[PDB]
Amino acid sequence: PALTKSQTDRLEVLLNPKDEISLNSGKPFRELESELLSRRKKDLQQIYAEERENYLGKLEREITRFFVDRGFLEIKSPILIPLEYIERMGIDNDTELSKQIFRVDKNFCLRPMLAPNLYNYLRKLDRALPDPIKIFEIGPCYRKESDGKEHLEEFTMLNFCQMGSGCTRENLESIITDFLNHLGIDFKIVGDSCMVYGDTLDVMHGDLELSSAVVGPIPLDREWGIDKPWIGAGFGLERLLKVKHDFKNIKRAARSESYYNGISTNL
Ligand SMILES: CCCC(=O)NCCCC[C@@H](N)C(=O)OP(=O)(O)OC[C@H]1O[C@@H](n2cnc3c(N)ncnc32)[C@H](O)[C@@H]1O
Ligand SMILES: [Mg+2]
């Protein structure tokens, strides 16, 4: 008797990318399930006995070390931010990204991106730090989404940026290139052909967007008291993990009660 679709869904929760076993080979569901539960328990036992690190926390520490070693100051800014920051980001109440925002009181929301706090740090630190100013933040962001294959409602962003001298497209591409080759993630940078000043580049892994990146200046800068050249990029940590570990579903890389380091916790 063939596996039912529900049975197949159950086994896939338990399946790992490198398991390499035939789901079409005559063996009953109960035995296939029992073999996989056994392997997944072994995986959790190995982690507990040896490393004990969460993939998301560990990616965060590896990324932090990378950017600190290259001259970028580590920022930890509020996750709960004023709603006014969203409007000041040019997201008017008509825009679709405006529908994706988790509001908290009359006045606050969960940040859907790192840019507003980074803009404020850029302006402030410009009164104290020598040119160029190099900063980054890693942390949670929130968007109400309409999909769930590559999009989470709760995700983790890395954003880095540089302001002042050296803010070129070539330098932006070089830092992105060094970063992803350090992590061992394959990519290609796509952008408009002959664009110089206000460019937007996407960093792609096949059809999956890893990052969008910007070469400033852009008109929105003046709303934040910024009047210097800059470069920057934002990367989703869960998309990076999904590519690195070859997860079929991004939920396996998220903050979760259902998966730990890509392994089902429902054993
Ligand atoms: C002052 C300095 C500002 C600065 O430095 N600006 C340039 C940075 C632009 C970036 C910034 N402005 C930005 O938001 O873009 P995004 O909405 O395309 O998200 C970027 C990445 O986050 C991930 N991502 C986005 N939404 C999701 C989601 N629902 N689930 C998982 N990952 C996601 C995904 O990897 C995506 O490519
Ligand atoms: Mg985008």
> Which CATH number fits the domain that encloses residue 17?
1.10.287.540
Say which amino acid occupies 226. I
Q: Give whole-number Cα distances, 68 to 130, 134, 136, in Å.
A: 16, 10, 9
- Residues 43 and 57 reside in one and the same domain: no
* 112 C-alpha to ligand 1 centroid (Å): 9
Give the separation between CA 35 and CA 73, rounded to whole angstroms. Answer: 48
Q: What are phi and psi of 68, to 5 degrees?
A: -65, -45
CB–CB of 131/99 below 8 Å?
A: no
143 lines ligand 1 (CB under 6 A): yes
- Residues 68 and 33 reside in one and the same domain: no
Give the separation between CA 261 and CA 245, rounded to whole angstroms. Answer: 9
Nearest ligand 1 atom, CA 226: 1
- Residues 133 and 29 reside in one and the same domain: no
Nearest ligand 1 atom, CA 209: 37
Q: What are phi and psi of 62, to 5 degrees?
A: -65, -40
Ligand number nearest to the C-alpha of 239: 1
Q: Indicate which CATH number applies to the domain containing 158.
A: 3.30.930.10
Q: Tokens 């001298």 label which residue?
A: 165
118 lines ligand 1 (CB under 6 A): yes
Q: Tokens 């520490």 label which residue?
A: 61
- Residues 74 and 124 reside in one and the same domain: yes
CB–CB of 241/59 below 8 Å?
A: yes
- Residues 133 and 30 reside in one and the same domain: no
What is the 3 state secondary structure string of the chain? CCCCHHHHHHHHHHCCCCCCCCCCCCCCHHHHHHHHHHHHHHHHHHHHHCCCCCHHHHHHHHHHHHHHHCCCEEECCCCEEECHHHHHCCCCCCCHHHHCCCECCCCEEECCCCHHHHHHHHHHHCCCCCCCEEEEEEEEEECCCCCCCCCCCEEEEEEEEEECCCCCHHHHHHHHHHHHHHHCCCCEEEECCCCCCCCEEEEEECCEEEEEEEECCCHHHHHHCCCCCEEEEEEEHHHHHHHHHCCCCHHHHCCCCCEECCEECCC
**Total number of domains constituting the chain:** 2
- Residues 131 and 158 reside in one and the same domain: yes
List the residue whose alpha carbon is closest to atom 2 of ligand 1: 115
Residue 41 is part of which domain span? Answer: 1-52
Give the separation between CA 2 and CA 10, rounded to whole angstroms. Answer: 14
- Residues 102 and 46 reside in one and the same domain: no
Give the separation between CA 242 and CA 170, rounded to whole angstroms. Answer: 27
Which residues are registered as beta bridge partners of 255?
none
Q: Is omega for the bond preceding 112 within 30 degrees of 0, making it cis? A: no
- Residues 207 and 174 reside in one and the same domain: yes
- Residues 195 and 217 reside in one and the same domain: yes
Of 9, 27, 52, the residue at which a domain comes to its end is 52
Of 19, 37, 52, the residue at which a domain comes to its end is 52
- Residues 106 and 219 reside in one and the same domain: yes
End-to-end CA distance of the chain: 24
Could you tell me which of 250, 234, 194 has the C-alpha nearest to residue 55? 250
List the residue whose alpha carbon is closest to atom 34 of ligand 1: 236
* 212 C-alpha to ligand 2 centroid (Å): 5
- Residues 211 and 122 reside in one and the same domain: yes
46 lines ligand 1 (CB under 6 A): no
- Residues 75 and 206 reside in one and the same domain: yes
Give the separation between CA 156 and CA 238, rounded to whole angstroms. Answer: 7
231 lines ligand 1 (CB under 6 A): no
